[PDB]
Amino acid sequence: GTSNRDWWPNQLDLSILHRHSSLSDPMGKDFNYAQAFEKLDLAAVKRDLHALMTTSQDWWPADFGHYGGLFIRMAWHSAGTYRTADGRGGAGEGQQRFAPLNSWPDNANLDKARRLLWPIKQKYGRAISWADLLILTGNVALESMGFKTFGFAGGRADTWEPEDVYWGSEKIWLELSGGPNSRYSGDRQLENPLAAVEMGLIYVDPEGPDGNPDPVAAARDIRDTFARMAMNDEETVALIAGGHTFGKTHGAGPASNVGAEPEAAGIEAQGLGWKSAYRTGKGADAITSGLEVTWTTTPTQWSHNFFENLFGYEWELTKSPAGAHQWVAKGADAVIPDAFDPSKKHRPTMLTTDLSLRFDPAYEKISRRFHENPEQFADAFARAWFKLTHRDMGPRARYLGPEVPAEVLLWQDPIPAVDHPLIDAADAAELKAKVLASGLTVSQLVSTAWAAASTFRGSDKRGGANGARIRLAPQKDWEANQPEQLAAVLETLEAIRTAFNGAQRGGKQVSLADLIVLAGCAGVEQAAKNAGHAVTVPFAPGRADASQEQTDVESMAVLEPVADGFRNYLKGKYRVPAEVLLVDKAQLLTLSAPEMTVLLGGLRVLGANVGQSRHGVFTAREQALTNDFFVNLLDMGTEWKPTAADADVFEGRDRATGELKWTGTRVDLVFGSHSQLRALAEVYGSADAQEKFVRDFVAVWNKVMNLDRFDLA
Amino acid sequence: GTSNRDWWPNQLDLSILHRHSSLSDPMGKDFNYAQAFEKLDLAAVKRDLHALMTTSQDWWPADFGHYGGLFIRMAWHSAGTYRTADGRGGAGEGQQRFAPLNSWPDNANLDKARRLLWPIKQKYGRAISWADLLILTGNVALESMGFKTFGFAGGRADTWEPEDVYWGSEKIWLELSGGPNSRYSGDRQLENPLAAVEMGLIYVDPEGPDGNPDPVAAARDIRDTFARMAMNDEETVALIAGGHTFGKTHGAGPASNVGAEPEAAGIEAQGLGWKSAYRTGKGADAITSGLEVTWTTTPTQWSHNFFENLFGYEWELTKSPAGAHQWVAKGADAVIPDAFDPSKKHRPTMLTTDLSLRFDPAYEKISRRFHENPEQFADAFARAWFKLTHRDMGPRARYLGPEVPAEVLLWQDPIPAVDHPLIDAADAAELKAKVLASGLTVSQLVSTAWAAASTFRGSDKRGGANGARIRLAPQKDWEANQPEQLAAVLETLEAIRTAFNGAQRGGKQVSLADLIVLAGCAGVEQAAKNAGHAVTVPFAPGRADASQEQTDVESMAVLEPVADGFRNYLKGKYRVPAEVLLVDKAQLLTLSAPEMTVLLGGLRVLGANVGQSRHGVFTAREQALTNDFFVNLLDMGTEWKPTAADADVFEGRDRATGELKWTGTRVDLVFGSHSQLRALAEVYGSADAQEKFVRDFVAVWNKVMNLDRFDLA
Ligand code: HEM
Ligand code: HEM
Ligand SMILES: [Cl-]
Ligand SMILES: [Cl-]
Ligand code: NA
Ligand code: NA
Numbered sequence A, B: 001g002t003s004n005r006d007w008w009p010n011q012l013d014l015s016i017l018h019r020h021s022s023l024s025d026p027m028g029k030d031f032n033y034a035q036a037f038e039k040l041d042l043a044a045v046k047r048d049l050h051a052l053m054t055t056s057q058d059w060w061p062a063d064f065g066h067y068g069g070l071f072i073r074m075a076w077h078s079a080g081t082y083r084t085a086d087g088r089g090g091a092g093e094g095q096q097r098f099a100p101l102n103s104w105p106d107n108a109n110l111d112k113a114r115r116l117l118w119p120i121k122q123k124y125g126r127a128i129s130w131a132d133l134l135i136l137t138g139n140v141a142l143e144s145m146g147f148k149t150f151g152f153a154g155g156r157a158d159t160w161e162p163e164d165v166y167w168g169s170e171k172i173w174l175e176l177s178g179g180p181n182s183r184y185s186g187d188r189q190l191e192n193p194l195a196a197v198e199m200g201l202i203y204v205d206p207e208g209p210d211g212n213p214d215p216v217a218a219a220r221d222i223r224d225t226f227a228r229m230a231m232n233d234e235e236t237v238a239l240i241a242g243g244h245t246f247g248k249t250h251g252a253g254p255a256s257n258v259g260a261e262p263e264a265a266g267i268e269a270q271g272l273g274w275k276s277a278y279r280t281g282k283g284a285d286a287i288t289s290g291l292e293v294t295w296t297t298t299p300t301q302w303s304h305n306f307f308e309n310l311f312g313y314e315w316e317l318t319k320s321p322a323g324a325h326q327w328v329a330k331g332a333d334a335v336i337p338d339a340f341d342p343s344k345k346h347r348p349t350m351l352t353t354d355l356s357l358r359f360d361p362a363y364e365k366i367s368r369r370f371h372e373n374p375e376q377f378a379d380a381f382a383r384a385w386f387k388l389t390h391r392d393m394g395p396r397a398r399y400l401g402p403e404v405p406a407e408v409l410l411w412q413d414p415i416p417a418v419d420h421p422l423i424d425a426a427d428a429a430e431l432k433a434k435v436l437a438s439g440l441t442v443s444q445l446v447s448t449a450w451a452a453a454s455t456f457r458g459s460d461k462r463g464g465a466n467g468a469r470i471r472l473a474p475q476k477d478w479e480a481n482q483p484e485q486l487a488a489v490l491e492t493l494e495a496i497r498t499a500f501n502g503a504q505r506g507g508k509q510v511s512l513a514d515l516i517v518l519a520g521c522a523g524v525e526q527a528a529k530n531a532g533h534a535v536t537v538p539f540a541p542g543r544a545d546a547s548q549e550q551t552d553v554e555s556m557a558v559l560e561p562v563a564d565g566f567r568n569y570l571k572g573k574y575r576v577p578a579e580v581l582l583v584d585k586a587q588l589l590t591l592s593a594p595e596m597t598v599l600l601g602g603l604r605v606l607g608a609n610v611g612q613s614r615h616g617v618f619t620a621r622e623q624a625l626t627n628d629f630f631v632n633l634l635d636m637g638t639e640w641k642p643t644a645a646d647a648d649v650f651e652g653r654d655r656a657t658g659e660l661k662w663t664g665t666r667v668d669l670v671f672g673s674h675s676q677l678r679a680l681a682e683v684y685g686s687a688d689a690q691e692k693f694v695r696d697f698v699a700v701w702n703k704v705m706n707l708d709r710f711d712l713a
Helices: A033-039 A042-053 A068-080 A110-116 A118-127 A130-144 A215-227 A233-243 A305-312 A352-359 A361-372 A374-390 A425-437 A442-453 A483-503 A512-530 A553-559 A578-588 A593-606 A628-633 A666-672 A675-684 A690-705 B033-038 B042-053 B068-080 B110-116 B118-127 B130-144 B215-227 B233-243 B305-312 B352-359 B361-372 B374-390 B425-437 B442-453 B483-503 B512-530 B553-559 B578-588 B593-606 B628-633 B666-672 B675-684 B690-705
Strands: A315-319 A325-329 A638-642 A649-654 A660-665 B315-319 B325-329 B638-642 B649-654 B660-665
Touching: A033 A118, A042 A118, A042 A130, A068 A110, A068 A130, A068 A233, A068 A374, A110 A118, A118 A130, A118 B675, A130 A374, A215 A233, A215 A352, A233 A305, A233 A352, A233 A361, A233 A374, A305 A352, A305 A361, A325 A352, A352 A361, A361 A374, A425 A483, A425 A512, A442 A483, A442 A512, A442 A593, A442 A690, A483 A512, A512 A593, A512 A690, A578 A593, A578 A666, A593 A628, A593 A666, A593 A675, A593 A690, A628 A666, A628 A675, A638 A660, A649 A666, A660 A666, A666 A675, A675 A690, A675 B118, B033 B118, B042 B118, B042 B130, B068 B110, B068 B130, B068 B233, B068 B374, B110 B118, B118 B130, B130 B374, B215 B233, B215 B352, B233 B305, B233 B352, B233 B361, B233 B374, B305 B352, B305 B361, B325 B352, B352 B361, B361 B374, B425 B483, B425 B512, B442 B483, B442 B512, B442 B593, B442 B690, B483 B512, B512 B593, B512 B690, B578 B593, B578 B666, B593 B628, B593 B666, B593 B675, B593 B690, B628 B666, B628 B675, B638 B660, B649 B666, B660 B666, B666 B675, B675 B690
Parallel strands: none
Antiparallel strands: A315 A325, A638 A649, A649 A660, B315 B325, B638 B649, B649 B660
16 A cells, blocks of 8 residues: 655654554553552562573573573663664663564564563563563573672553664665665764664674674774763673673574564464574574574673683684684683583683673773672673663652662762752742843743753653753753853853842752743743733742762763754754754654644744744744744745755745745744644644643643653652 | 664554544644534635635636636545545545645645635634535535535534555556556456545546546446445536536646645645646646646536537547647637636537546436436535535534535435433343343344444444444345344344333333444443453443435445454455454544454454354353453463464464464454554453453443444534
8 A cells, every 4th residue: 555655755754753642552541650560569570580580481492491691681682772862772661572673683582582571571460561571580680690780770661662763774684884875984983873883783793893703893883882872991891791691692503594583474473583494493403693602601600701711712713503703712621511411512602792802902901800800890790780771761760669779870860859948839939020020031031941951852861951950061061052141041040049049048949950940931921921911831849950070971962952943953964854853852852743833833932043043933023922933934925935045044025025024944844834734833823823822832831841850750 | 764664564554543643633632623613603704715716816816716616626626535435535534635635636736725725714713624614615616606505514623644545556646557556457447445546536537547538438437436436327427517517627738847746845835736837837827637628608607508518519539738638629619718818718628527428328318317407407416516525424413503404315324313211321221131131142242232333434434333224234134244143133132122112101212223232231241240240331322223214225335344353254355464454444443452452352252253253262251251362362382373274264272282272363363463462462461451451341342332423422
């Protein structure tokens, strides 16, 4: 059946905004996963998981009699899709169970792992999500094998359909670089937002870059991908060597024996894939990656053998039974156990990417320090496994259960506890009046609160106005934030704050984080008053101010908006059309198409554009909260044409006189072109819609102001 | 960006079920269009429309100073996409304004018509839907030009995204038949459910079949397509000649002058398309279809000149200025007015398809009767225009406003008024107990109520249990309905009915339509009781019983289920996989994926399968309402393989012993295969899910029982 995507493959796609509807979710509208989890008997679940480790099923027998390696890999792949550029991927939504991730080549036979966990999932039902269960199982595998974890938080709610993530443009699994849809250009520069070297891989190619078995060049890829997953050199080394202390790879025969991945398999496969024609197709005969490497002399127990082997032998290039490049220890005895036959032993083996930990000079220093000080290695690995598996969970307030680590970690973007009375409704009214008496304008107030709140992204639940990080490096210097204007607003709000707090007794005080947001609310109220209308903008106090030392400047850099169509901002010239980037921003803000539409139209007329641009400011009463944007956008009296100077700017002229009435960007005019967006704009541009527009604007403004408010969830 | 559809293009698509979410709808959750419409000043709207017909805009000047022909075409196209096979298309959702219909070649320049209506749309806002306004404008156009319409109903609520309709498989607009995706096979057999001869056409090619200008062969296509749009020969002739009493076609120059359709046009086009490089590109120079025909001497006034010309001249094959085949009156005077130059006149002209009305022998007899009796022609046209424009509106209960026709028409599947008090809650309890005491089984009761209610389709709002048409021809003899079993059930319910009604005082009585539904309710309660669970199934009385004489048997044929995966039923062998057909049926029933899932799993274990088939009956307590279907489908101890006899039937065997446990179809096992459906099944198959399964089942059962209950809206 031919579809709209076939006819118009470059038309803007809005379905990414209308994912995660109550239509596809089986749980009732009222279901609250945190509440269900909080009642789970987590200790019972962990007992069941421990039992499972050595309960081998014949349809996928356990290596060494212990599923722990398989499960650590499962948990590591669940978390390992995470990209810092957009916060997408990661373990927090359980997306490993859906397309495409359930069928990525690097996820081969993790279908079997997941199926092993169905009886437990079934037994505890809604009180433990698959998303949580996958991480918990990895933890229990570690514990079962003698490694003490740093802790565990529940609270990842399950999702019910695939997310729309850009995973690259290649049309071939595992395609090497430089093809027609290459994710690399220049001197091996990976395109943002990607964090893997090939389509369908988690990070890097275990044989080496584009298959070339060079550990030194492989290190470069490892460093770059892992940095794009928020991991530094120490964390990277700890995770790779820690992981590879356990289990084995699977490459017992040629890859051509492996059949269809799960999404391609027959209905009778019942959701599994990669069925293999090689010998028994499983166990001793398994084929997953094609590599045949067992790293340590005790693959089912924590040890210090990984670095003992890495440094204690010289390594020779060889091939697995499937023809894959890997490494064998020169002159070594057969000291590695076989996974199934007690009478067979094997020489130590390594991947190319394992040898990178020794042959890259900066990794070599860390690895040697871990070899000499295994307690340092064990602590680094524990910490990095916690980070790996919680990096997309958001503020600590979302962390559930009895194993949450008390230690506050910098990567959590921590927010201090509030320890004083909060402002009440009378105080909020007093502060809004002081703010409006100061001389700050509607445009300034709205722009500043928007700058502060709109850093939030739902993908990894980072950002937002909590913390008052807008006052700190690097937010305060971001171009989109208008650093000089912002400094002036903040100075005035800081003096309001200081004066209010100085007059209180008790310990009541207002945070600057709250005051920024409240001031934005005063600006939206005043804008409604400018339009002749009473309005009340909801405000919830309780944000705190984080310090500079609680704000990792390098980590915060991925939150910088380089495109923000809500402020008609584009930092540079991109390949992707600006309206595409607006929908991507809308998705990160968790907005539906209607919310995106009302929000942008209001921001326009309130003066939120960067640089005071008149692009899309379709009103003759700027700083008044009206539906002017939509009424004027849809007026057929105006004709639109791209300028000579710039094809991404448009001039709107009176159709009869030729006179210039407005200018706009693609972000502006898409509302008058896209057939679904223009249907939305029509509702808000109708003569019966001024009250609707204000009500809907205030609701979405409030939504944005509270996106990070998990302390009120 | 590569998507799941690219990787796995034949995987089943569930997004058709989660269209029309509250996420994409800008109106609040509580908005009720009927309430808004009921207070519209419809007369004021029609006054503004009447004024509009002769107020020309320079950006698309009005032919002859009158937009009436443009707007009649607009409304005929709005309604003209309707197919009886599935009820899809039609005017009732305003889908002309979205992709793909907004960009079909046959809809060329209707973008301009719709734009001309924005000021009115804007003025009246949410109180008149685009869907209604498109039809109302066609009516007003007819009225303004001297034609008395049969009436008008409002109540088509607007939609906010495109429907997922199968419009054919061709990858080229207007592709002639016999291509690699040909919609024709055999001796010019058009594939179901399609109702047009080419991709992007409303019905037929105005030049003739695949462009061969033969009126006799074009008649064949006309008859077949119009029959697939529920029109008979008399209605077809009336419509075509009626329409072509007005306006003109547009073909002033070559087609290559016409640019991109709206979905492909530049953002600056602001939702318009087909911009033409030919002279002024509009008005006297317009190009729409490429044909250049004006049918009558008064294109802005109702007349009987179309048949006068048709029969009063002989016709010669000629070419338009764009090279299209059309017909000109041999030896005629220049009596047809020009659309813009008062000093020019033209000879009469016709399309090939217009001459079909004279050269097809059956059309000729009708056309001649209409020529001799133009009052007959006007009445037939008025009735057929009403049918055309209301065919997908559903039961007369949905019809709103002051111009609804009082005459009840057979094609409306009419339901007699109820004229007696209804049963109350205590009566319903008494009846459920009588039904259960009769000996009728859970399987009988659930199967019969399902058979009666599940003919409903949301596409045109036909079908459902109201009417008790299950007792009548042709429903009572449909294979899916198990005619002999059904007759026995109905006899027993009819005796219960007679005994209850005989005992009442006052005029209280219960309809057989209500009793069939109530009995099904008693069967679901009893099945819950059989499982250890007391539940009350909601029931709403007020259905009435329609007669055989109020039931058009031929029209009812398109509602026969030839595939019903809810009953594990396939009447024959189809190209489309059965699971595809289940999701198509779920969409017709207005079901979400969770609803489809729960409902199927419960039906299985209640014994609703046709023929008492064991396929999918994964329980040892049939006729008890339990979640056994899901628990047993998801049990990894059972291995599934296609049978030798039939690849579409599967055996489930114990994995260890080989013992045969179950058999299933693709419809059953897709719940264990598809990654999204299996996630749903897992929720219902969990150990905490018994109460949820029962509650969700009862709610979806009740929803199906009430699909046609617009009397309670
Ligand atoms: C440069 C990074 C990495 C590369 C290229 C990589 C590569 C792979 C490959 C190819 C396999 C074999 C799959 C198979 O055939 O069954 C595997 C196994 C595994 N990896 Fe990694 N890996 C990396 C990092 C990680 C990390 C960070 C962890 C966890 C902290 C991890 C834990 C595991 C474990 C436990 C196994 C063994 C699976 C089993 O016993 O079934 N690896 N690795
Ligand atoms: C076999 C069926 C039909 C065919 C092949 C057909 C074909 C066409 C074509 C090719 C045009 C010219 C489009 C343009 O170039 O602007 C047109 C115009 C029009 N048709 Fe039809 N038509 C059919 C049926 C109908 C019916 C059922 C109605 C309404 C009852 C309708 C009403 C009109 C009107 C009013 C116009 C004039 C548009 C104007 O003045 O701008 N036609 N038709
Ligand atoms: Cl994601
Ligand atoms: Cl439709
Ligand atoms: Na994420
Ligand atoms: Na329809």
